[PDB]
């Protein structure tokens, strides 16, 4: 029963908190929490590889790709391990995130603890954008907020 947490802070007003829970080893992982300060609509939501925050979110590096695969939506087989799709922020900018992903894990080869949770500016196209940047980052835009994922329990 491993519990993690991440506090997304950034230069702008976007900030929030996202906890992770895993009951089993190499099983499903719950990802729940709340972001605020975003614009209304779809924002990118990824787990980038490096847990660096020296030069800001640009220090986070690319999406967590251990298997060396192309970019896609979370429900697709061809996707980065760190690809969690998009989040929605309502008229208040309050993105209530609740997700269950069995691709990520708090342990093993797909461990995301110590990696950088990153929310983006625009939406991810889930790898169907029809160009080269959709097959890498997913044209989600810039990196509004980012935080190091650490153990909560």
């Amino acid at each position: 029963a491993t519990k993690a947490v991440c506090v997304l802070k950034g230069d702008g007003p976007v900030q929030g908190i996202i906890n992770f829970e895993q009951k089993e080893s190499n099983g499903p992982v719950k990802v729940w929490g709340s972001i605020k300060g975003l614009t209304e609509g779809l924002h990118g939501f990824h787990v980038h590889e490096f847990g660096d925050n020296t030069a800001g979110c640009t220090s986070a590096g690319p999406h967590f790709n251990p298997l060396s695969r192309k970019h896609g939506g979370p429900k697709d087989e061809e996707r980065h391990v760190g690809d969690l799709g998009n989040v929605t922020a309502d008229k208040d900018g309050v993105a209530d995130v609740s997700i269950e992903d069995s691709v990520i894990s708090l342990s093993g080869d797909h461990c995301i603890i110590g990696r950088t949770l990153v929310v983006h500016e625009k939406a991810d196209d889930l790898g169907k954008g029809g160009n080269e940047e959709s097959t890498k980052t997913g044209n989600a835009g810039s990196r509004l907020a980012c935080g190091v994922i650490g153990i909560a329990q």
Partner: nanobody
Amino acid sequence: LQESGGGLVQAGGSLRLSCAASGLPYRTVFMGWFRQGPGKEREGVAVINADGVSTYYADSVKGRFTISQDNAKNTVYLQMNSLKPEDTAIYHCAANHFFDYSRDPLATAEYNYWGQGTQVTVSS
């Protein structure tokens, strides 16, 4: 996603379907059963989470059908009783490696892994 069980029954009989998750790269997030009636859309019957208690049923099969999970054989069972002639359907097993809880746990758009699909038909 191998499926077992099914066939024919009368108005008010019983049946039990089983689906074993086979050769899946990742673990299961939401496994269950959908159905396609004779000339109808694939409608969600009954699904269940990885925890073995979180279930979600259709309103047509509410109270009547019952989904369970064996986990030992990562198999999901659906017990369908008092089947009505509307229960005549190709039943399709469904799986998931991801799920957004802000969406419908009973939509075909929410699942990418599917099985062969058995047939459950009812008389009268």
